[PDB]
Design a protein around this ligand. Structure first.
Ligand SMILES: CC(C)(COP(=O)(O)OP(=O)(O)OC[C@H]1O[C@@H](n2cnc3c(N)ncnc32)[C@H](O)[C@@H]1OP(=O)(O)O)[C@@H](O)C(=O)NCCC(=O)NCCS
Ligand SMILES: CC(C)(COP(=O)(O)OP(=O)(O)OC[C@H]1O[C@@H](n2cnc3c(N)ncnc32)[C@H](O)[C@@H]1OP(=O)(O)O)[C@@H](O)C(=O)NCCC(=O)NCCS
Lengths: 377, 372
């Protein structure tokens, strides 16, 4: 038997935050300073063609004279983020074709909200999940969160397979980083520390439905991929390579310059560990060649993709869906890997030919690479 | 079977008794009706001891300003994480196995938010293997101890499915007194009495769970087997407890109706647990609460009383639960583990044991454990 992905959907926010838009927001509230000018200059070189915010150009978020309080940042996530998550979740359930009250597990993730109850609880009510649905809300993982959620759900579902009962997991990732855009601009102006987070991140929610294959119903979509194995690797390191630190007005991002370098060193090691821990693949030497797999890589930044591409012996065309998600959507944190799976799914529906095995990889906090291997059924 | 094979807890070292709290409060606020009412309630909680990571002479209690959120985070890192690594180390010691053979880490807190989370730091402090499989739970509050057990239980069943060894370290770490200065200031400004000031204390606790595969001679045999875990979310407009983010940390809102809801929902929660347990669901005697041992998260004294009456139990049935509350107070997600520890220690009881605790989203987490 095996655990499979049986539904996929994503929903970026609706309002463009292009380079012109960001410049207009920045110069509205701050005088020219060298950090402001460097940030804007870098912004135009990200090679992101589109990213999106839940806040339209005329929204008060971009015009108010004050920085949103943390409580306001919370309310904004509830007002804009949760509906985005409910839509993406509903669409994934629709793709799956099954019924909401037959979902047994909910695995949710965000790094742009902290609340008690968490947004997973709200989602249960909005989607009409059963009263005994088994919820998990992941924290502390950041961009590794999409793969982290798949890893957890994969094992939970194997646990139900152990008991011989049906299990269907909804994975939901919800990120609204533009909520913190005003705070980050203000910090960058005050410290004159250039923050490339201003340039990279956008708003999105995405979801998967996974099944353990027990008690399959005719209404359910057959397996898109099977999940064979997931393997995280935490690498040695003084401090993390990215931080998202709490403060009075929300979270502040610290993005280390060394990320592309470290990506080049660690991704091949991560991949090697993934294969060696996969009993059905660990023995044969050919399984340790990256080009024998399709690839999906979390595009933390353009240079991050380049670094992985070169280190893995791949071509940019191998990573086409990863570049495409980055180019149209930007870095949407935990949701990005799901947007890439959707792109890959959609391309296969259009006669495209892809490898039989597919590796997912993404950096998560604690210098930890999350990886997964998926197989075509 | 998935089993619990190691248990440990560690409350913070400094007493926060009634005299101490009053001294802190009057140091910074002139008398107001809400202040006097809070202090009056504080002396009626029937908590004999609760603890803080902050000594009476610590700047936390003397500084004229309310700590920033960044400070609150640093404080958790400085005092909370060492408490967590001590509890974790001691649970691993109780287990008897070696750190790099822990396969899963399930951590939980509601008194810190960080990227990376405190789970990552613990991996390094404890020397867990580089591919240890971490999960940091959020949004669950006092239900987190049982929530963590529920998650770890299923993950380990997942390894049983693959036929491989699994050992899960569960770690709960709560330092609510970090937010005591902010809560006092909010209560003063709004004159809204906040009983959170009276109930909560600092503590870390840990469990080791095993799926029983690849058992080594050095490992402690099963203390309990975990048979089933079952959460029930009940209908309701707003939660019965909130822990809401704001500029200087989190602010607690504790609803007056909790004990009443406890009486209504706990029996339903129990019934759902048994009906969802194939090996018990059929026999009608299994639906009688007094046929089980009980551990219940003591959100407050009146919460214990409500569950006790509604389940037809005695206070002696809930002795370990009252004892944890009396000596340690409400330590959030860690409390259920402190109760398991007491129960284990007393043994060194009935064949089956039910755990129950309120978690956010009006959700009751429950578990059924059995004697091996
Ligand atoms: C930001 C980025 C798109 C710029 O692309 P580019 O212009 O082709 O790259 P360059 O090396 O020419 O960088 C241009 C400028 O960006 C600056 N820059 C790059 N990464 C930076 C970082 N993490 N923080 C601050 N500045 C940074 C460089 O210092 C350089 O400044 P200069 O013009 O004063 O010399 C690219 O460097 C990138 O993708 N970086 C990875 C971002 C990342 O780590 N993402 C993960 C987030 S968790
Ligand atoms: C707080 C507590 C220990 C007080 O014990 P008690 O004095 O025997 O209980 P009483 O009913 O006499 O309450 C005394 C006072 O506490 C007040 N009080 C009780 N619960 C309160 C709450 N949640 N918020 C604010 N005030 C509260 C009562 O209004 C009453 O005020 P009054 O004396 O001015 O009329 C008890 O009410 C309790 O344990 N409640 C449960 C707390 C809870 O829900 N905890 C869960 C945290 S998630």
């Amino acid at each position: 038997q095996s655990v499979s992905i049986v539904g996929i959907a994503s929903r970026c926010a609706p309002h463009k935050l292009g380079a012109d838009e960001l410049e207009a927001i920045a110069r509205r509230h701050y005088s020219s300073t060298p950090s402001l000018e460097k940030m804007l200059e870098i912004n135009r070189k990200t090679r992101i063609d589109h990213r999106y915010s839940v806040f339209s150009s005329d929204h008060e978020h971009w015009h108010r004279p004050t920085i949103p309080s943390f409580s306001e940042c919370d309310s904004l996530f509830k007002e804009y983020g949760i509906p985005l998550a409910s839509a993406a979740s509903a669409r994934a359930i629709q793709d799956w074709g099954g019924v909401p009250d037959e979902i047994t597990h909910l695995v949710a993730v965000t790094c742009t909200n902290t609340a008690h109850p968490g947004f997973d609880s709200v989602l249960c009510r909005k989607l009409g999940l059963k009263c005994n649905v088994r919820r998990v809300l992941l924290h502390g993982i950041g961009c590794g969160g999409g793969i982290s959620a798949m890893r957890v759900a994969h094992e939970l579902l194997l646990g139900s397979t152990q008991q011989g009962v049906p299990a269907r997991a909804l994975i939901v990732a919800c990120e609204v980083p533009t909520v913190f855009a005003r705070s980050e601009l203000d910090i960058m102006d005050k410290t004159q520390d250039v923050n490339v987070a201003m340039c990279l991140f956008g708003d999105c929610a995405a979801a998967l439905v996974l099944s353990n294959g027990i008690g399959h119903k005719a209404s359910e979509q057959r397996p898109i991929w099977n999940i064979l194995n997931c393997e995280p690797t935490q690498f040695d390191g003084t401090e993390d390579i990215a931080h998202f630190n709490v403060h009075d007005k929300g979270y502040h991002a610290i993005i280390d310059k060394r990320i592309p370098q470290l990506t080049g060193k660690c991704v091949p090691a991560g991949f090697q560990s993934l294969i060696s821990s996969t009993p059905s693949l660990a023995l044969e030497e050919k399984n340790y060649v990256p080009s024998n797999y399709g690839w999906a890589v979390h595009p933390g930044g353009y240079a991050v993709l380049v670094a992985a591409q070169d280190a893995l012996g791949l071509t940019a065309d191998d990573l086409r869906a990863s570049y495409d998600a980055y180019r149209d959507g930007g870095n949407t944190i935990s949701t990005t890997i799901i947007r890439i799976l959707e792109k890959l799914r959609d391309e296969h529906k259009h006669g495209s030919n892809q490898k039989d095995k597919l590796v997912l990889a993404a950096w998560g906090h604690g210098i930890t690479l999350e990886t997964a291997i998926l197989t075509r059924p």
